[PDB]
Amino acid sequence: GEIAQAXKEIAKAXKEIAWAXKEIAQAXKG
Amino acid sequence: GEIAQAXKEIAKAXKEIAWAXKEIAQAXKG
Amino acid sequence: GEIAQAXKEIAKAXKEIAWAXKEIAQAXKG
Amino acid sequence: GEIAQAXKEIAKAXKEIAWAXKEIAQAXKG
Amino acid sequence: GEIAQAXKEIAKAXKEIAWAXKEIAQAXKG
Amino acid sequence: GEIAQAXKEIAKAXKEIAWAXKEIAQAXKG
Amino acid sequence: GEIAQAXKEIAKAXKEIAWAXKEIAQAXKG
């Protein structure tokens, strides 16, 4: 369904946020 | 539908957050 | 509709978050 | 409606997050 | 209603995130 | 209800985010 | 249900965000 799929798109965008925060962690490590 | 499209706007806004966190990572790296 | 408009308000608020993160990045640059 | 008003409460809480991240930016600049 | 009440719980949890970011701001000031 | 319970799981996960941001604040404090 | 399951996917992605913030804290601790 379109609403469920749009909620999956939200979930995928929150995973992108997580990956961006991992880039911040890598920056402070290096 | 209107609700599904509004949820997709939420997803797009979260991608903007993800990009801004990549900007923070780049700023820490110099 | 009122639910779709409220979800658009959420999307606008998450763009405010993104912009605040960009301000953090510009603070770390300088 | 109750669901729309609750979604508005979520939007207002996301604006509070934005304002807090602005505080972080000011703290890094000070 | 239960859906509206659960959306209010999400808003309460977002305010906790805002508080935690004020803690990070305070930690950088010191 | 299953939708309300899933929204409560989102709220709990946002609390987890808040706790993790306090860990960042503690790290800056040390 | 599909919508409940998509909301659970959002909750899972927010826990990934929390983990990445723990990684940021760990990188600031050395």
Author numbering:
A (entry chain F), B (entry chain E), C (entry chain D), D (entry chain C), E (entry chain B), F (entry chain A), ...: 1 to 30
The paper states:
The combination of a = Leu plus d = Ile consistently forms α-helical barrels. First, the Leu residues at a were replaced by 4,5-dehydroleucine to give CC-Type2-deLI. This unnatural amino acid is similarly hydrophobicity to Leu, but it has an sp2 hybridised Cγ. In solution, this peptide behaved as a folded, heptameric, α-helical barrel. Indeed, its X-ray crystal structure overlaid almost precisely with the parent peptide CC-Type2-LI.
CCs are quaternary structures comprising two or more α-helices supercoiled around each other with cyclic (Cn) or dihedral (Dn) symmetry. Here, we describe variants with all combinations of the aliphatic residues, Ile, Leu and Val, at a and d to give four classes of peptide: the ββ class, with a and d = Ile or Val; Lβ, a = Leu and d = Ile or Val; βL, a = Ile or Val and d = Leu; and LL, a = d = Leu. Peptides are named systematically appending the one-letter code for the amino acids at the a and d sites to “CC-Type2-“; e.g., CC-Hept becomes CC-Type2-LI. In summary, solution-phase data and X-ray crystal structures demonstrate conclusively that different classes of Type-2 coiled-coil (CC) peptides—i.e., based on abcdefg repeats with predominantly hydrophobic residues at a, d, e and g—adopt a range of distinct states.
